[PDB]
Design an enzyme around this catalytic site. Structure first.
Site, PDB file in Angstrom:
ATOM      1  N   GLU A 202       4.496   4.409   5.826  1.00  0.00           N
ATOM      2  CA  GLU A 202       3.647   4.059   5.749  1.00  0.00           C
ATOM      3  C   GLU A 202       2.563   2.511   5.604  1.00  0.00           C
ATOM      4  OE1 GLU A 202       3.139   6.380   2.148  1.00  0.00           O
ATOM      5  OE2 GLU A 202       1.099   7.264   2.341  1.00  0.00           O
ATOM      6  N   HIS A 213       9.221  11.990  -2.301  1.00  0.00           N
ATOM      7  CA  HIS A 213       8.053  12.011  -3.685  1.00  0.00           C
ATOM      8  C   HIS A 213       8.990  13.420  -3.250  1.00  0.00           C
ATOM      9  CE1 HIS A 213       5.089   9.574  -2.785  1.00  0.00           C
ATOM     10  NE2 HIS A 213       5.185   9.533  -1.277  1.00  0.00           N
TER      11      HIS A 213
HETATM   12  C1  LIG Z   1       6.192  14.541   0.517  1.00  0.00           C
HETATM   13  C2  LIG Z   1       5.112  13.725   1.715  1.00  0.00           C
HETATM   14  C3  LIG Z   1       3.526  12.970   1.246  1.00  0.00           C
HETATM   15  O1  LIG Z   1       4.089  13.319  -0.099  1.00  0.00           O
HETATM   16  O2  LIG Z   1       3.255  12.354   2.525  1.00  0.00           O
HETATM   17  C4  LIG Z   1       1.493  12.519   2.558  1.00  0.00           C
HETATM   18  C5  LIG Z   1       1.714  11.672   2.071  1.00  0.00           C
HETATM   19  O3  LIG Z   1       2.262  10.297   1.361  1.00  0.00           O
HETATM   20  O4  LIG Z   1       1.198  10.186   3.775  1.00  0.00           O
HETATM   21  C6  LIG Z   1       0.169  11.562   1.864  1.00  0.00           C
HETATM   22  C7  LIG Z   1      -1.071  11.041   2.349  1.00  0.00           C
HETATM   23  O5  LIG Z   1      -1.308  11.696   3.399  1.00  0.00           O
HETATM   24  C8  LIG Z   1      -2.996  11.369   4.365  1.00  0.00           C
HETATM   25  O6  LIG Z   1      -4.040  11.946   2.858  1.00  0.00           O
HETATM   26  C9  LIG Z   1      -5.070  11.280   3.703  1.00  0.00           C
HETATM   27  C10 LIG Z   1      -6.105  12.278   2.138  1.00  0.00           C
HETATM   28  O7  LIG Z   1      -5.622  11.135   0.755  1.00  0.00           O
HETATM   29  C11 LIG Z   1      -4.907  12.369   4.796  1.00  0.00           C
HETATM   30  O8  LIG Z   1      -6.536  12.495   4.474  1.00  0.00           O
HETATM   31  C12 LIG Z   1      -4.332  11.734   5.620  1.00  0.00           C
HETATM   32  O9  LIG Z   1      -4.676  12.931   7.603  1.00  0.00           O
HETATM   33  C13 LIG Z   1      -3.033  12.378   5.345  1.00  0.00           C
HETATM   34  O10 LIG Z   1      -1.594  11.825   6.046  1.00  0.00           O
END
Ligand SMILES: CCC(=O)OCC(O)(O)CCO[C@@H]1O[C@H](CO)[C@@H](O)[C@H](O)[C@H]1O
Ligand SMILES: *[C@@H]1O[C@H](CO)[C@@H](O)[C@H](O)[C@H]1NC(C)=O
Length: 400
Positions: A202, A213
């Site tokens: 990320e 998580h």
């Molecule tokens: C177990 C994995 C986990 O919880 O992963 C997920 C994350 O951590 O990326 C949480 C965020 O995901 C992102 O959230 C926004 C909405 O808030 C979307 O528009 C994006 O497409 C998406 O990738």
């Protein structure tokens, strides 16, 4: 929803499988946009519901009616392109905006036959990928992660479920967000859509983050009430690893002053170590840039164990209380062993501006530059490219 009859043309993505004995062998995989990026609509053009809510009550009073009234549109190669998604050899390009339209794609990796998500079993193994981060300023998040999505996109859970993995259905994550569809069927009860999530990557060009998580329910679980919250079934916060938070502020960033220079291409390697009973016990990371291995740095604050990887001790010592309560690293590994879907996406945030990723103790962004209205003045066309994805035995996927 019900897919229409337009031809779906999934961008081809070459990936690699590796062994210490024979190297890395190329294979063909395919990319699919999320079911919702395809376009899900009634016949009069109204949508079937927004993110955060149950599906429209008039098109979806029950499940059979939702499937009849909510049409999912086939995506041809132009549709993929206009959705900001393109590939080339082993590269996947994800663009945040196409012609001043916000597209912020989220995609999944498909097996070669296209009917199933390529399920990855990472406990005990290694995953490597290259990435280009130059075009992601403060407030952006170019992401590579896994979720415990049903391989078939939810098809076997219901006769009303038609989309499957071919159309990118069955998304879930550890935030337990309420989405209009769940398992390729209308979310009539407005349950939060939960599942174990491994955030390998990320990041933007100013800060990177890693976070497992775990959740107490296996596979995709529809939560209700207290199940969906902070004392619920899923670890929302995750057990995090960010060089800035452990006070190594010169590790990752823009230019020659950082050990990993985010303005030029680099390789990201993640190793998921298990014990002899096959339980995951620790998550390691190293980098390769300019042909040189770069090691992650040791914790540079007092408290946590002086190590450079994630384990339960580190997580307990850095306050990851929901992570330990819900089973910790072992529970994470159990979902990794059952199999998980790979997801790749680009996005920003209108509320917090991604502050947890790159502000204060997380990085060098001020309080407002990561607002989307300021992001586009630093970089009009924020984008990210993930490529050269190689999975397999520890020690085999990357190297000097
Ligand atoms: C177990 C994995 C986990 O919880 O992963 C997920 C994350 O951590 O990326 C949480 C965020 O995901 C992102 O959230 C926004 C909405 O808030 C979307 O528009 C994006 O497409 C998406 O990738
Ligand atoms: C829900 O769908 C109905 C029927 O087509 C439509 O009249 C209504 O305006 C929709 N709600 C939203 C918020 O779009």
């Amino acid at each position: 929803q019900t897919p229409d009859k337009a031809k779906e043309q999934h961008p081809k993505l070459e990936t690699y499988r590796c062994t210490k004995a024979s190297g890395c062998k190329k294979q063909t995989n395919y990319i699919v946009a999320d079911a919702g990026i395809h376009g899900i609509r009634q016949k009069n053009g109204a949508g079937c519901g927004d993110w955060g809510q149950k599906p429209n009550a008039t098109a979806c009073p029950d499940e059979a009616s939702c499937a009849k009234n909510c049409i999912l549109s086939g995506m041809d190669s132009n549709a993929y392109k206009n959705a900001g998604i393109t590939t080339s050899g082993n590269k996947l390009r994800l663009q945040q905006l196409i012609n001043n339209q916000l597209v912020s794609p989220r995609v999944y990796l498909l097996e070669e036959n296209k009917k199933k998500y390529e399920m990855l079993h990472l406990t005990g193994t290694e995953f490597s990928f290259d990435v280009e981060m130059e075009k992601l300023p403060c407030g952006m998040n170019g992401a590579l992660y896994l979720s415990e999505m049903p391989q078939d996109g939810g098809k076997s859970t219901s006769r009303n479920s038609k989309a499957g993995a071919y159309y990118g259905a069955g998304y879930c994550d550890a935030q337990c967000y309420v989405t209009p569809f769940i398992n390729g069927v209308g979310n009539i009860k407005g349950q939060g859509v939960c599942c174990n999530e491994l955030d390998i990557w990320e990041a933007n060009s100013r800060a990177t983050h890693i976070a497992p998580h775990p959740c107490s329910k296996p596979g995709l679980y529809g939560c209700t009430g207290d199940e969906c919250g902070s004392s619920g079934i899923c670890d929302k916060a995750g057990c995090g690893w960010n060089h800035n938070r452990i006070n190594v502020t010169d590790f990752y960033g823009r230019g020659k002053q950082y050990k990993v220079d985010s303005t030029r291409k680099f390789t990201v390697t993640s190793q998921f170590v298990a014990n002899k009973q096959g339980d995951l016990i620790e998550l390691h990371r190293h980098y390769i840039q300019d042909n040189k291995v770069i090691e992650s740095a040791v914790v540079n604050i007092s408290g946590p164990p002086k190590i450079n990887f994630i384990n339960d001790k580190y997580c307990a010592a850095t306050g990851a209380n929901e992570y330990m309560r819900l089973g910790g690293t072992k529970q994470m590994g159990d979902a990794m062993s059952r199999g998980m879907v790979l997801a790749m996406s680009v996005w920003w945030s209108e509320g917090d501006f991604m502050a947890w990723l790159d502000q204060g103790v997380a990085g060098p962004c001020d309080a407002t530059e990561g607002d989307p209205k300021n992001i586009v003045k630093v970089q009009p066309n924020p984008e990210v490219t993930f490529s050269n994805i190689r999975i397999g035995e520890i020690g085999s996927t990357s190297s000097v």
